[PDB]
Amino acid sequence: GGWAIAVHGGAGVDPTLPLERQEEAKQLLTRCLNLGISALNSNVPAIDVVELVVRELETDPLFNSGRGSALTEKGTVEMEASIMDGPKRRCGAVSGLTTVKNPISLARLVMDKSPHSYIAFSGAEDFARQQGVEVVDNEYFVTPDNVGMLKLAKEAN
Amino acid sequence: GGWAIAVHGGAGVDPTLPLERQEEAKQLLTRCLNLGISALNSNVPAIDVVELVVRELETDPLFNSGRGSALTEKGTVEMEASIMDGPKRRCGAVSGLTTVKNPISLARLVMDKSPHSYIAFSGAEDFARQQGVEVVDNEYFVTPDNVGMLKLAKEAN
Amino acid sequence: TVGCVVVDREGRCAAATSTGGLMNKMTGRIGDSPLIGAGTYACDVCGVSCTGEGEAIIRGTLAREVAAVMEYKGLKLHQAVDFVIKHRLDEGKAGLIAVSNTGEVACGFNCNGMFRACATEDGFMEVAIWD
Amino acid sequence: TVGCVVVDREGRCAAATSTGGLMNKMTGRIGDSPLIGAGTYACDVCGVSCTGEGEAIIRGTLAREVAAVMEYKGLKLHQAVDFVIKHRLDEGKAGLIAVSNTGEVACGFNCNGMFRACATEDGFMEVAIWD
Numbered sequence A, B: 001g002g003w004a005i006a007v008h009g010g011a012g013v014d015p016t017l018p019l020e021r022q023e024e025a026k027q028l029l030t031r032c033l034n035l036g037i038s039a040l041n042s043n044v045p046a047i048d049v050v051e052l053v054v055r056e057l058e059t060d061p062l063f064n065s066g067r068g069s070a071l072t073e074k075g076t077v078e079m080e081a082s083i084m085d086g087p088k089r090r091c092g093a094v095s096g097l098t099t100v101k102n103p104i105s106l107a108r109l110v111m112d113k114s115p116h117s118y119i120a121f122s123g124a125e126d127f128a129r130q131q132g133v134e135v136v137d138n139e140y141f142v143t144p145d146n147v148g149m150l151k152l153a154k155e156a157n
Numbered sequence C, D: 001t002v003g004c005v006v007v008d009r010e011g012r013c014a015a016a017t018s019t020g021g022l023m024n025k026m027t028g029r030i031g032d033s034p035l036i037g038a039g040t041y042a043c044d045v046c047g048v049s050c051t052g053e054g055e056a057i058i059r060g061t062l063a064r065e066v067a068a069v070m071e072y073k074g075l076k077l078h079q080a081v082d083f084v085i086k087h088r089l090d091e092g093k094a095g096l097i098a099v100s101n102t103g104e105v106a107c108g109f110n111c112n113g114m115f116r117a118c119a120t121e122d123g124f125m126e127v128a129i130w131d
């Protein structure tokens, strides 16, 4: 009858992955879970905890989201996310984000500050600026490893 | 063990819609169902029938899809569509279309001729050209009937 | 929004939905129509296409739900349809059309009306606006 | 893909999923992550977040299914997740994490591994990749 929380960093793991990269991933999961654990102890609502925990997962370049996102055929980043509040089944979702620092919070904002449930690409970029969220150039989200992964993926084809 | 088919043109009827407009609507619905009925008597697979019937619904300017689409806050047209084939639960979807003459057919193409289920905005426009479907200027989609209803809607705030 | 659901002589269901979306909608707004499980769904048992308030159809997963209540509550098609309109809408206005793999056909809605038409091979045929 | 599911002390569920999508995806491709009912779902009885092969999770309506088999088959949270995973994936590889309104927590997948962590106020805590 008390709080619970899960976090994930994606399914499908490289079996060729170094022990150290694996510890780093674990460190990250722990830190994020911990933000959640402490938040639930201070009695913050479940809907706020999912957002703040995902913000940390987006900001750290390890996993495939926010900074460190996978790359398109074009070598750029297009991000997307969704959030939902159980009680009254409230929903927000975004796609085609190119400059928005934390997609999950824009989704949260679609839920709370727009008549819609899902806004995408240019119109979602314009929503970002109306809501004054932190935005940045696309290059910010692109990391070296993802660039190497893209080359390797293009070659498998 | 027999075929069945339904066809719709949107829930939410003008509570006072003229008999005149009602007859047009029923006639269109009849014409569309007929294409469907005939296809089914000739043993066309269901997935082919839904597509061909919705093209007729998209081309005719009466309902809100294709030509005759509702307008965005900017007074243009952004169209979306999806399609699914029951037996293997195969999917295709498109959103943010501005030039594609028949959105449902692009969605069929996503399902059959792309590694993805869902492609939207610019990327979907590009896929339209990669697949050589009929494209036109966005103006083609705007009916004077719709321009009027937007003016009326934007004032209604 | 326009749509079409079919079950053929082979028992195969399929569904298709296409729309311009909500009038005056914000640029880039995406409704229920292109979202599998929301505006459109088809599996072994049925084929469904929805129309109405997108935001309400999305949070209701309406199309998938028609299939869900038949698989898990074992309802009949016409009931599944009507169960779904009653309990998944919560002040939202929507409707939908559906076929089953047994050659059944249903509509359902909670709006003043829905432009629809349906037929079966034994020769049923209705075209309707109100009801 | 990354995600978090949470039930608080009030028994309220919520879920969030965020991603850069699939490496080398075509421009404008949308996966399961921003799709309510596929990648993310939360209701009265649960909160779910999925990751894995978008197309499988999408056709699978995965996140909504965990809730459905609870609300319609009466199954408890852990049974639900195993049910949806083993008996609703079909050759597609995906995982999910989920929370119940009763204070329970659950992970589940069919691929080689899933980066994940869960805690339960019982002082129960764990963080894994394989298993």
Ligand SMILES: N[C@@H](CC(=O)O)C(=O)O
Pocket: B010, B011, B064, C001, C019, C020, C021, C022, C031, C032, C033, C050, C051, C052, C053, C054, C055
């Ligand atoms: N389903 C459409 C509207 C309609 O059904 O007429 C939407 O919400 O975008």
Ligand SMILES: [K+]
Pocket: A057, A058, A059, A060, A061, A062, A063, A064, A065, A066, A067, A068, A069
């Ligand atoms: K990240």
Ligand SMILES: [K+]
Pocket: A091, A110, A111, A112, A113, A114, A115, A116, A117
């Ligand atoms: K909203």
Ligand SMILES: [K+]
Pocket: B057, B058, B059, B060, B061, B062, B063, B064, B065, B066, B067, B068, B069
């Ligand atoms: K039309």
Ligand SMILES: [K+]
Pocket: B091, B110, B111, B112, B113, B114, B115, B116, B117
């Ligand atoms: K495909």
